[PDB]
Amino acid sequence: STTSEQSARMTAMDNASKNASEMIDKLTLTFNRTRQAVITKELIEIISGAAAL
Amino acid sequence: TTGRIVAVIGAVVDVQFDEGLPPILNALEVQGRETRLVLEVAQHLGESTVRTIAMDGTEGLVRGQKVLDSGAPIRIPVGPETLGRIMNVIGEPIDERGPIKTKQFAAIHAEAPEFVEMSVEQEILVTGIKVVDLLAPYAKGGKIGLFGGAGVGKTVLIMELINNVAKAHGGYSVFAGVGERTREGNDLYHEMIESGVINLKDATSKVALVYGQMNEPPGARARVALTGLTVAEYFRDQEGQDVLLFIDNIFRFTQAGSEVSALLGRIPSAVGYQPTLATDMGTMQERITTTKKGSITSVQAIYVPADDLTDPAPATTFAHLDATTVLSRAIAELGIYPAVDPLDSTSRIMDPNIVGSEHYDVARGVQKILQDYKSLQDIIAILGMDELSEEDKLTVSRARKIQRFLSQPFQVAEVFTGHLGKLVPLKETIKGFQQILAGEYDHLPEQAFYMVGPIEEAVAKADKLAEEH
Amino acid sequence: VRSSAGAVRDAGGAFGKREQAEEERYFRARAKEQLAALKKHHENEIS
Amino acid sequence: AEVSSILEERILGADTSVDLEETGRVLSIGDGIARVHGLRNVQAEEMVEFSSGLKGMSLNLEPDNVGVVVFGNDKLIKEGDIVKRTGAIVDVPVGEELLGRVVDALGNAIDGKGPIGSKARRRVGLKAPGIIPRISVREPMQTGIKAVDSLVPIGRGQRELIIGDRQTGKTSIAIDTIINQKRFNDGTDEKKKLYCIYVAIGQKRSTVAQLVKRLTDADAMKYTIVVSATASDAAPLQYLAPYSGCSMGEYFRDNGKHALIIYDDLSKQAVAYRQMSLLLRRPPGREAYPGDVFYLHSRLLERAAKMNDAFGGGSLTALPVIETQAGDVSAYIPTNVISITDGQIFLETELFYKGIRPAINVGLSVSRVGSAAQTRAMKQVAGTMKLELAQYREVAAFALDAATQQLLSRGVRLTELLKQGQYSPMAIEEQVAVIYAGVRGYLDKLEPSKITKFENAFLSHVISQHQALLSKIRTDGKISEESDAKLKEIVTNFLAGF
Ligand SMILES: Nc1ncnc2c1ncn2[C@@H]1O[C@H](COP(=O)(O)OP(=O)(O)OP(=O)(O)O)[C@@H](O)[C@H]1O
Ligand SMILES: Nc1ncnc2c1ncn2[C@@H]1O[C@H](COP(=O)(O)OP(=O)(O)O)[C@@H](O)[C@H]1O
Ligand SMILES: [Mg+2]
Ligand SMILES: [Mg+2]
Numbered sequence A: 001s002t003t004s005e006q007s008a009r010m011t012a013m014d015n016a017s018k019n020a021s022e023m024i025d026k027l028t029l030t031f032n033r034t035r036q037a038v039i040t041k042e043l044i045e046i047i048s049g050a051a052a053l
Numbered sequence B: 001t002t003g004r005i006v007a008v009i010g011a012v013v014d015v016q017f018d019e020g021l022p023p024i025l026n027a028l029e030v031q032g033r034e035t036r037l038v039l040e041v042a043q044h045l046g047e048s049t050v051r052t053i054a055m056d057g058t059e060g061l062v063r064g065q066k067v068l069d070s071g072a073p074i075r076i077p078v079g080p081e082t083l084g085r086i087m088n089v090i091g092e093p094i095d096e097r098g099p100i101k102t103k104q105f106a107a108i109h110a111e112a113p114e115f116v117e118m119s120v121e122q123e124i125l126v127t128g129i130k131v132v133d134l135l136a137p138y139a140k141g142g143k144i145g146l147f148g149g150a151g152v153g154k155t156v157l158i159m160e161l162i163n164n165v166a167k168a169h170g171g172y173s174v175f176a177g178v179g180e181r182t183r184e185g186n187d188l189y190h191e192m193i194e195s196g197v198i199n200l201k202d203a204t205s206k207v208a209l210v211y212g213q214m215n216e217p218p219g220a221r222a223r224v225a226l227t228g229l230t231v232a233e234y235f236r237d238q239e240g241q242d243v244l245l246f247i248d249n250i251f252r253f254t255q256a257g258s259e260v261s262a263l264l265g266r267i268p269s270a271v272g273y274q275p276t277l278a279t280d281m282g283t284m285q286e287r288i289t290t291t292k293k294g295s296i297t298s299v300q301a302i303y304v305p306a307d308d309l310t311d312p313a314p315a316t317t318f319a320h321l322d323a324t325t326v327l328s329r330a331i332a333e334l335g336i337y338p339a340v341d342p343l344d345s346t347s348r349i350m351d352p353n354i355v356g357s358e359h360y361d362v363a364r365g366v367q368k369i370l371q372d373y374k375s376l377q378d379i380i381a382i383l384g385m386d387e388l389s390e391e392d393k394l395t396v397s398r399a400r401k402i403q404r405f406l407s408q409p410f411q412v413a414e415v416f417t418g419h420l421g422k423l424v425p426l427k428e429t430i431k432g433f434q435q436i437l438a439g440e441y442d443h444l445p446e447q448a449f450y451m452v453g454p455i456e457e458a459v460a461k462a463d464k465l466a467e468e469h
Numbered sequence C: 001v002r003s004s005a006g007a008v009r010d011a012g013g014a015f016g017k018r019e020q021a022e023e024e025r026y027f028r029a030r031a032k033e034q035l036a037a038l039k040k041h042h043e044n045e046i047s
Numbered sequence D: 001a002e003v004s005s006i007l008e009e010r011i012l013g014a015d016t017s018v019d020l021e022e023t024g025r026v027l028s029i030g031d032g033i034a035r036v037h038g039l040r041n042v043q044a045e046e047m048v049e050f051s052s053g054l055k056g057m058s059l060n061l062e063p064d065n066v067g068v069v070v071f072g073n074d075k076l077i078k079e080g081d082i083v084k085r086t087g088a089i090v091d092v093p094v095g096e097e098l099l100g101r102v103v104d105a106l107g108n109a110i111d112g113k114g115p116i117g118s119k120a121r122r123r124v125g126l127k128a129p130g131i132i133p134r135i136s137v138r139e140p141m142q143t144g145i146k147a148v149d150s151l152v153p154i155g156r157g158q159r160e161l162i163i164g165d166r167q168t169g170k171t172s173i174a175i176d177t178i179i180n181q182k183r184f185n186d187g188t189d190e191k192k193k194l195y196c197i198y199v200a201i202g203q204k205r206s207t208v209a210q211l212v213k214r215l216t217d218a219d220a221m222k223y224t225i226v227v228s229a230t231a232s233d234a235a236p237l238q239y240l241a242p243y244s245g246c247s248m249g250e251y252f253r254d255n256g257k258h259a260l261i262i263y264d265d266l267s268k269q270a271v272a273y274r275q276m277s278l279l280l281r282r283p284p285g286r287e288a289y290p291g292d293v294f295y296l297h298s299r300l301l302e303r304a305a306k307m308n309d310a311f312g313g314g315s316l317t318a319l320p321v322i323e324t325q326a327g328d329v330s331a332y333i334p335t336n337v338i339s340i341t342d343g344q345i346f347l348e349t350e351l352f353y354k355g356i357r358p359a360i361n362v363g364l365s366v367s368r369v370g371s372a373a374q375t376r377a378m379k380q381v382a383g384t385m386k387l388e389l390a391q392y393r394e395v396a397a398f399a400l401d402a403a404t405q406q407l408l409s410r411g412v413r414l415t416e417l418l419k420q421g422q423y424s425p426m427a428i429e430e431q432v433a434v435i436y437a438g439v440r441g442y443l444d445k446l447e448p449s450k451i452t453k454f455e456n457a458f459l460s461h462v463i464s465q466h467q468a469l470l471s472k473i474r475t476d477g478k479i480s481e482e483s484d485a486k487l488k489e490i491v492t493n494f495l496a497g498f
Helices: A002-051 B130-135 B154-166 B182-195 B218-237 B251-264 B277-285 B312-320 B357-380 B392-405 B426-438 B455-467 C014-044 D002-012 D146-151 D170-180 D182-186 D205-217 D241-254 D267-279 D293-301 D332-340 D349-353 D376-394 D402-418 D428-439 D448-465 D467-476 D481-496
Strands: B002-009 B012-017 B027-030 B038-046 B049-054 B066-069 B075-078 B104-107 B143-148 B172-178 B208-212 B242-248 B295-303 D024-030 D033-038 D046-050 D055-061 D066-070 D083-089 D091-094 D120-123 D162-164 D194-201 D224-229 D258-264 D315-318 D321-323
Touching (some): B049 B218, B130 B357, B143 B154, B172 B218, B208 B218, B218 B242, B218 B251, B251 B295, B251 D293, B392 B426, B455 C014, C014 D402, D146 D428, D162 D170, D170 D182, D170 D321, D194 D267, D224 D241, D241 D258, D258 D321, D267 D332, D293 D332, D402 D428, D448 D481
Parallel strands (some): B172 B242, D258 D315
Antiparallel strands (some): B012 B049, B027 B038, B075 B104, D046 D055
16 A cells, blocks of 8 residues: 555656646746736836826 | 916916026915915926925916915924924914914925934834844834835834833924824824823923825825924934934825826836936935934834835835834734734844844844745645654744744734733843744643733743633 | 745635645644643642 | 696796806817816816806816816817806705705706705815814714624724625625615614715616615615716716715714715726826826826815714715726725725625625725724624634634534634625624624534524514514613523524524
């Protein structure tokens, strides 16, 4: 039982790490999109304020 | 000199002068108002026009209304006669008690002390609050900050400090409420009257109040800080004595500056802030200093919009402070009050050569154990507490005991908790934390340490918990 | 973009609450055990 | 026959007087903003009138022209029109004559029902009461929701904030608060009567009609004013409706009476103000909102005071309603109003769908007054309930030992106790009875899916058999020892008998 349990824990941790890696990839893509969008939004606010004087 | 309103847009009034113009920062008085409306000059636009920010509501102003030029910046009454009173930005009293009868009027705009006036001495100011005294000890004559979002304990903490330091402080004191709820202003007025620092009968008042609450137009909020600062400066120099100066919040000064910048023709900066944020804040925070002629202990509450410590306003304010106590919402949710963040607070005097090696080592041990606890919390989210090394569980237990032991009941938070306020002398706090780290209490349960004063009270609370078990 | 210690409980997602509970239950149990031992010591030390 | 007679009665009294009035020519009209030329003596934020009887406000006083915002439709104003200054800052009718009347942002009757008989007018833009007139909040404002009256209590003169997402139950809390005041307003003493004002900003007329009929069904228009500036009303009206309603409530608080005002929402007044400011060409700010967007609200919510006994003793509670986007409380207007108000009531969709209704997030909801402004019985019981839920929320994320198992059991029992229906607010003594039964380990035997059945049946049983005990609790305002012993025996008997 202990041998099989340790094998299963190794497999489960490997799969969990793989899933966390896929989720990290997706969230990194989302974070980059959001960061660029925030830069653009702040810059457009500044531009509109400057041109609206 | 006499001029003539030519435009009114929001809180910004454009006034035209046929004679010589008035210099920037001068106060002008609008003629034809039932109350007193004071405009302050902010720009010269050419063609004899001057732009100004109104220190009051600009309702009922008519294009053409005559304006008088006082010839000097806003001059407030200063002296021992302002103690126990309340004031506007423009210095007129709002306590419904009669005129302030002083011989000295001080202009609210002045140059900051020069570099050849700075005091370089620091000695701990014991406030009686465990977390503050241990991890971010204050200092006489130094500027203190209380960062944190909304609903974390800024006002309660500042009221607690007034309760402790101001009550037993020989020198005078000043409270400038900048852009805060008027309910709180009234509550403070009545609490001070009850305590006795404000005496309505004799001339023994020890506190002077200035109020610019959040119903005022931006012009008044941007200047009430300077009014309170002027009162404090006079008490520093002429009286030649120690002063305290509490401000709540010093973020409303910045914000009020931001509400008129766009109408004064300035392009905005990083996040809808005026281009002159840092300069405007510096020209004020640089007069709140302990020169060699006096000594101002300045406590400032600083709103952090949306808990974002990287916002330009708090981010800039960080550089003007000796000590900071960053109240944190994530710790106030846990019920640890005051919610001071032990890892995000700092002090200048926190060196082994100013406080001592025992105090310094205890503080650093506490901070290290809390950081290790934070590192472990990530693992506990996957393993569970049952699977930690029997040494790690010891770290977690010590960390939780230390986390609870930093909580303390205030004498002003009786209404919320219902408990009784405790003042913990510095030696007792050092002893308590040194013992908790050394392991002399690794058998008492965690909750014994929650909301108690010195460590012996934790022992007694644990004894009571055991007896009624 | 990096990661820092004590971030699982900073997000406050599901793992944050799960970890908070996994900690609180364990330490409530240990506090109960320690309180029982404290009562026993109290009684045994009266004389 | 008499129809035409009463028609004539109107003409018989007319306005003969024609006066010599100052004027101005509309240089340019478009998007709801006129640029008048002339009006050399027009004041700031004064009320002017157009050739077609349409009103407006002179908001911008530039050297060459006056920027006027039209309180209504804009298609009827041409270039070269005539604008006559009325010589009066914008003001609205006030008085008890408005009670039960639906009015627009400018105080014009909107439901037919004739005109308003108001004898007095008040300026919308009035300064808040000073620091001296006020006095700390003492009385409780009875809302009728168990979770609000127990865990986040509201006093009279406080400024709570109801903040949440769309469709979480904010207007429902507002309507429950309005309806509950019926019991106090029907009674005799005038120190408890609370007149309610509901400002409906940006809500479609159908929603306000549903709300008004709901109040009428509960017979709650005897003391309610409804100031509706709906979506189709020009932005200068949705921007001004909160101030009109706040003046109608300032009248009450200044005349020794108590008032409750409910701005719904303020996040739409902010949008209307932004539209106005952008069409006057004022430079935008963050998220395009003007710079003076905090002021806009701070000057409005600072008028909800609690006058001391020298100034009448009247009070004006405020319950602004904000709407966040996907729970982003960190947005701009939400943070402004959160830093303006006293308390908060966080409604969450995750709690709304998990079955907890009202969704009040008791973990985050706050109330600075807290202890004060709570009845002694509620203060006694809700304190222990608050501690029990606080402990429960810590160990809740999972689902062994007897102590913690019973802790979870008690927490869950209390949680299902706090649920409630719509438009059925409870008397405070009834809430005390239910919470006492729940918190004194009585319901720990029952299943948690049956707690609603208990609550309901217990209420129905007590309201008839033990009316005397409830009257005792209300009158004496505390759970005395004899009252506690009674409550004990009633609950013990009822639990077994069910
Ligand atoms: N206590 C409750 N019990 C059952 N249902 C409720 C309760 N409170 C609210 N609801 C439901 O939630 C829905 C929305 O209610 P309400 O209008 O109060 O929320 P809202 O946020 O004001 O909506 P909106 O913001 O879109 O106007 C209603 O249809 C109602 O059925
Ligand atoms: N020392 C304390 N003990 C218990 N609760 C506190 C304490 N300080 C603040 N609070 C809580 O915070 C609220 C007051 O916060 P406050 O400090 O006035 O807000 P801010 O810090 O944003 O100005 C109270 O309702 C109370 O519940
Ligand atoms: Mg505050
Ligand atoms: Mg609604």
